Structure 1
């Protein structure tokens, strides 16, 4: 039950969630800086203004990574640090930060994986239409070109987008995340431009062809199970799977949108230029998979004919069902449907109500249990033919959990946000052992 020699064990973060220094060194405002200033949008009125203060404390966090024996570390790049404003001019201080981070990773034999876009769009791009505008795909490609030119040979794994489905749903359907639009009819248009931006970014990457470097995209999924064996429930589950799990995968791999997508978005074809599917479906080097929980579905008489059924137990602090078999099923399904392409699990983890004990230790056995089940499921998938290349725990650090603010702790390392003190949780200690053993037990 050892994983393959060279298997990439990592942990993941994102820029807005950990960096702080929101207005330092010429950094421009992002849509998340703006969103968190809006009263009522975030629990406890929290923001990423300071977060984990990682922009200043990155060397401490690098040593924590080393202490755990991480083989790889997934971070995102704050686009607004790099292009603060509409002049499109490169901010050298912002770029230098990522240069220093990447140098530090290599110094400690940790392989960098960089996410170009983890939701912190520069406000200047939003002022030019954001993801509603086709031109934002070109802006994203110019940003990618700059970063890959600067750091390509030093970052062996690049991800264009993180969870474009969440950007669509939370950002444009529900208004729960930045930029806070609440118009379901916009989802197709946004999805197409996210996909187009990925494609143009990938073209920029191929043009530069950095030595030893690869590029992919990270998607989130919720494995779908029908609540019963009834045909109507099976049908609802199939439709929900197509939409929830294959909206992006289908165009990425097959160069077409699926029927569930076109029905949900019936004006989508109006945004597709003659090239656009070819560009979107150009080969990626790997797929990033983010998974936390399944969704359970039943048929309904009322539109859209699908109801998601909530689960009371077993759940995390987010109310998300704990079902490690969901991860196995997801990985097998992707592999069977789209072929045996390289996969990294770019996020998997859990939020629990962690509290230091009287001695100052943070013991999180529920999180250990979550990782035990899920890493076990990933191992079974690998045994059964999935080309799993790495696993990244979400998250290295407790951090700013978007609209939940600091009420939710996903870290394997506990952060006291009053003092910025970091403490390895029991789960970090356990994970260090897994890495050293190259597997469970």
Structure 2
């Protein structure tokens, strides 16, 4: 029942999804500033120009974190605030903001976890080739060094990347997210340079070696289940798992790409230099796990011989299936396959239609049911030997949900985007009790 003494209960956000002040204090343009100017790309023509106006209101948000009793808070750093342009010079005002944020967290006994890259690449980096260019791994490492040198001993947990797979799939295969390319053959190349940037960032971290600080990476996964017990379906499920869930994990832990990856991207070995794989697979301090839903697959006659079968119920407002057993299986599978390493669930959460009632309360019993089941599955994984050190709710605040804009609300705290007024939902109240009790009712 009760989690371990000192278990780190938290909530998470990302810079572009909450900060606003998109052009203030010397901040540079990011690929998402640019992307949200293009008509038709975002529902309702929404953008992150203002978002939760967190850059201006962070002290209020710091107080909200204290109100919930968070032991930890996960955010991302906007690279374009730190290095607005191709001169690579550090913008001191951008840096001051994260210094102030982190100082406020320690003031309130909240341990900081910072994600260096949560998708808002500076436009200047994109003009130098973006993730297609190998040199971007070096720009990322320089950016990392600056941030770790400045805040290393103030930030005990560092994540290099959030969900490199989504940057590949949504950013380059589908054109759904920035930078908006639609060429499948570019995937392997991008993936390699994302991995390489992580490796070079971790080197920079070890060189600085800040006291009491650790560094890792966050990956997303969708637990794969075959739609039937038929051998073709099992085989499609196995290949889908290798690709969807181990494209990054395998080279990170084992130092090599798996077969399903090399077959999906035949030209991949062309970007791999002689010590890349060693750099990529150097020891991380912990793994960040993001999870929302499973994927159910069947075999297909047409390439690539895999079909994802859509589920109609039970789902969230995103249409994503609700299956807590999927989180438990993912955690058990990682721990069995790669060994018992430290894991933080860095995002787990759900979107539902939220509407303040006449009295202004925001009651979201379906979000409470989602968290109840998932935190319960996490506790079972811990009981079964998974080294789980923390759990972060996605998200602290309703925010800019990428291509869905503001039409999707993931927050435990409701945000009225007209007034910037924040309201604890029923789920935040509930979660506060979980933290106080250090476990479920």
TM-score range, shorter chain: over 0.9
**Structure 1: any 5+ residue segments left out of the alignment?**
none
Counterparts of 1:175 and 1:117, CA distance in 2: 19
List per-residue Cα deviations over 1:381-418 (Å, max 9, x = no partner). 00000000000000000000000000000000000000
List per-residue Cα deviations over 1:70-128 (Å, max 9, x = no partner). 00000000000000000000000000000000000000000000000000000000000
SS of residue paired to 1:407? coil
Shift of 1:45: 0.1
Establish whether residue 111 from structure 1 lines up as the match of residue 111 from structure 2.
yes
Counterparts of 2:286 and 2:148, CA distance in 1: 17
**Structure 2: any 5+ residue segments left out of the alignment?**
none
Shift of 1:194: 0.1
Counterparts of 1:212 and 1:181, CA distance in 2: 40
List per-residue Cα deviations over 1:257-296 (Å, max 9, x = no partner). 0000000000000000000000000000000000000000
SS of residue paired to 1:287? strand
Counterparts of 2:251 and 2:83, CA distance in 1: 29
Shift of 1:166: 0.1
Shift of 1:306: 0.3
Counterparts of 1:435 and 1:63, CA distance in 2: 16
List per-residue Cα deviations over 1:218-277 (Å, max 9, x = no partner). 000000000000000000000000000000000000000000000000000000000000
SS of residue paired to 1:27? coil
Please name the residue that 2:315 is paired with: 315
List per-residue Cα deviations over 1:176-234 (Å, max 9, x = no partner). 00000000000000000000000000000000000000000000000000000000000
Counterparts of 2:318 and 2:199, CA distance in 1: 33
Please name the residue that 1:98 is paired with: 98
SS of residue paired to 2:75? strand
SS of residue paired to 1:406? coil
SS of residue paired to 1:318? coil
Counterparts of 1:192 and 1:386, CA distance in 2: 29
Counterparts of 2:294 and 2:276, CA distance in 1: 32
Please name the residue that 1:377 is paired with: 377
Q: How many residues align?
A: 441
Shift of 1:423: 0.1
List per-residue Cα deviations over 1:369-391 (Å, max 9, x = no partner). 00000000000000000000000
SS of residue paired to 1:423? strand
TM-score under structure 1 normalisation? 1.00
Establish whether residue 401 from structure 1 lines up as the match of residue 401 from structure 2.
yes
Please name the residue that 1:172 is paired with: 172
Q: What is the alpha-carbon root mean square deviation over aligned residues?
A: 0.2
Counterparts of 2:105 and 2:220, CA distance in 1: 26
SS of residue paired to 1:48? coil
Shift of 1:145: 0.2
Please name the residue that 2:350 is paired with: 350
SS of residue paired to 1:393? strand
SS of residue paired to 1:297? strand
